[PDB]
Amino acid sequence: TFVDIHAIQTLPYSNINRDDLGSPKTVVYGGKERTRVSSQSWKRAVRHEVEARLGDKAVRTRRIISEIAKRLRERGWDADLADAGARQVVLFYLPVPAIDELAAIADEHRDAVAKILPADRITEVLKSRNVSVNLFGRMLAELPSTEVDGAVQFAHAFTVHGTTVEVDFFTAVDDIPKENDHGSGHMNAGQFSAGTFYRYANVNLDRLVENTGDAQTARTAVAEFLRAFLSTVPSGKQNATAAMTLPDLVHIAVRFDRPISFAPAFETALYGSDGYTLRACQELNNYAERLREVWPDDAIRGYATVENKTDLAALGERYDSYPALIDAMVAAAF
Amino acid sequence: PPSFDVTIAPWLIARSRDVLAAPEMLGLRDVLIRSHELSDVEIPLPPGAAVLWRILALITARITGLDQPPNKNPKRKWQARRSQILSKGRLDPEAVDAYFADYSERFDLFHPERPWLQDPRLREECPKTSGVNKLAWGRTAGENQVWLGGHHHDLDPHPLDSAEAVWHLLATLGYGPSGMCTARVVRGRSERNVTAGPLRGTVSYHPLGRTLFESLILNIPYPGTGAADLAFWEQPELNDPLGLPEESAGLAGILRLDHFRHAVLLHPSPDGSHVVDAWVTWAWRERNISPELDPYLIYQTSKEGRVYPRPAEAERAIWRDLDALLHYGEDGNYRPTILDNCTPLAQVPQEVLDSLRLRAFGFDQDGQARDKQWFTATTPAVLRWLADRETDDNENARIVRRITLARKAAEALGRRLEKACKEAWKESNSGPWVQHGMSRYWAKAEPVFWNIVYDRPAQGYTPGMAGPGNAFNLVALAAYDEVTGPYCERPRVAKVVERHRSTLFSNWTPK
Amino acid sequence: SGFLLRLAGPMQSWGEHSMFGERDTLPYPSRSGLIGMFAAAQGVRRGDPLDRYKELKFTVRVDRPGVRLVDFHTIGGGLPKERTVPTAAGERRDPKKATIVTSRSYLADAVFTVAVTGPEADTIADALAAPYWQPYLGRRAFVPDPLLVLRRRVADPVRELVEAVPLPHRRVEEDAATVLVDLIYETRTLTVLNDVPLSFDSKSRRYSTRQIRVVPTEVPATLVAGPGRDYQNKLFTYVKQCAE
What we know:
This is part of a larger assembly, with chains A (334 residues), B (511 residues) and C (244 residues). Chain A is of the alpha+beta class and 334 residues long. Helices cover 20% and strands 20% of the residues of chain A. Chain A has helices at 41-50, 97-104, 206-209, 215-231, 277-294, 322-332, and strands at 2-14, 26-29, 32-37, 157-158, 166-172, 186-204, 249-255, 300-305, 317-318. In chain A, the strands form two sheets. A six-stranded mixed beta sheet of chain A has the order 5-6-1-7-8-9, with helices on both faces. Chain A has a three-stranded antiparallel beta sheet with strand order 2-3-4, with no helix packed on it. With 244 residues, chain C is of the alpha+beta class. In chain C, 15% of the residues lie in helices and 30% in strands. Chain C has a seven-stranded antiparallel beta sheet with strand order 7-1-6-3-8-10-9, sandwiched between helices. In chain C, strand 9 and strand 10 form a beta hairpin. In chain C, helix 1 (31-42) packs across helix 2 (121-128).
């Protein structure tokens, strides 16, 4: 009931989220320096993309007003004047159980459609989802709401090989020249770093679906979550270093006992002069093999890869593409 | 009517010198009377502890110390006297009740008339209430953002226990923000502003021993002979918000308990064991600096003649109990006077001194209204264990010599590194490096300290030699060299950073 | 009875005495943290009585101390003028002053071998093997080691920490034995700190003081692993005989 997701993504020469002084955030793992992207970064970057679609899948497709079918229609409250509210429930996005209130406390009163102000009772959309509150913790602009957490554990993304920051000497050039040229605008130095990041996250549908209900709504939230986890990339200095990419390896596993990360597989840093994607793939495989043959369990494993050279056995059945993998895994999750 | 007196109501977490199991709550009179039976008393807030220990010391000095010097070689005779009270071993219960007999009506927090160190007149005369949030520390006030220290939305105010209320109250009455508090209309005059706390942003040093008794009498600073004055709760008439605060040469005016810069009040609940609302605002508007500087703090002189307390630093609390070790040294101008008049041998303690331990309550903050962190620091008894376990005079002296040496040099390079980073960053641009450099420097350099105390092979230098062997100096080179390493690439930053980097190499006594 | 958790992974941060922006961690785990983890593995919501977790014992052997790093952490920035974290009064701040900046510290690249000894240790172990909430190390964003529970059942697990447990590679002199490793037991105590957990409810966090004594013990040098890839291997073969 724990959807674990691992992904190897190589980011080029850029600076995703800098530190307090310009450098990119770094951890020192297995003795060696390793640039990292904070979990918050890759969170506000996934969320800010989820709502952008989930919260838009869609006011022009599924719609919220398109209710009544279970409280305003097959209930008697003006089976034809159904727009009763509807139009009276407007003057974020909820699931279904918390929608029972949407069509529930939307009846009674009078009504006043004969020509509509009691909202302190419906406003509690987030107090009970707002699925975007059960997937990820509370909102960021609303007071707490009984469910501060959580569920989607997100891990920091550190490189799989020691990478040192590199100073990018840069300068600004003023376009109005005096009779003493070369007086550029402002000399300065900006630090950048490149490398192949490892990323990981968990989704606990077990203690999740409860807070919501309709396993179908939950299924949609987790599926779009995984797609946003691979799809998104932070928005730090991208307009100056376009570093938009996709993970070179994607491994979703559904475990029925406990989530597990593969971070220690990358403990001993990798020396290079060659590429790092293939070595990282086969090494993650190896670690999955010994860990799988030491902690045996009946779990589901699947993975996609943008390189047909190696065959990853311990990672499950190699699906063809990311969305196929996500579909078959979310389906296999229940 | 709701009433809560600190005399018998339990609000202090106390534990005895016995088994050390199941400590429990005690009032003020109860922890005082049987102090001889209790090991120590504490409250979770170190600010509240820094003021609590001041009022406790002032009480014990009201009865035990007698807080009044005689007149025949006063200082000396006083040290003798208190040495006799220490020799006896405990408190006189009829003296405790003899002191409350004169003030049994003062200690009620919710007294309807003249409460305990609050302003009853401030009940009315205030248009709005400051709210309990502003009284509680680490709790989101009106303008703060609701993220940390547990959500508190200015509404549904979680009522605080009267214990927590006297803790936060006693702390806020001590450390206190400066600026834009609840307005008061004094004699028709309204003035919305307030001054800062007296102890705001400073580390306090309180000695503590085996039994709470000797700790109390050791926390008694020599009462400056002068016009005998009283603490805040003894004054017969309530102070005037306008006018200059009363002056006090006596200890009650040097422990900062004669007049406070703030004025809080608790609105009782009908139950009597909960606070529902509070008031926090200015009590005195005309500035006044306290003469006879505070014996607990450490003071340092700047240019122009002003003397100021050395501010606190979370960077020093990166390792536990760092300032606690000031009992070694000592240290060059870095020593509280209370210690300079109770820890040494020029006093008359005989064997409690051989078990004395230092404690430090620090709450770093900005001097205006922004708070950063609190922390306590009790010295490691293990450093005493090592000196006692060997039972060899020359080795008993070589060990303590090694701790003294390592500590002195440790902080020496700490401050030398601070000026190194301040000049490096202030000259590079022609700072932000001090925070990282120092944090990483102490965090990294303390395991070396524990490495030297157990004469184990440390970085740079192997056991066997006389002192610290000049090792954490190399640790300072490590921290400094890495905090500014990625930025010393171009020759400008390289030569300036290096020019300031050629200082860590001193003292640097060779092999 | 008892079991041996293996506190490791990329980052660990057991906080204490920090109720403001600046957050700090201890150079070793705190019982409040890992008891919060057991409590998270058994499904007790904040506010429930934690008396069950009393009577437990935690001696922890530090394998490597790990280096301390400060994590800069801004929250609410870049968001428009009408979305930040509200104020108590409800009136937001200006967008130029809206975000709040916390610089939370954390301990990185360290591994501890704790030895839990308690009456409920077996259900705790079986809870860590399948929890009712993602178990973390210090804070939610830190993901724990896969081998979070190194050995599930051992009588006198302290003796297991003193002998026959893999250690990471460190400098070992020629034919030298008796390599020191510090372990903390709970006179001659090192420090007192607020660890014992009394209540976790977000409305009133309540803790208490607890004694801690760090004893540097000696261990035979036959446990130090090789340079690279040897440590994880040896610990895998070590967890292999757990069934036996």
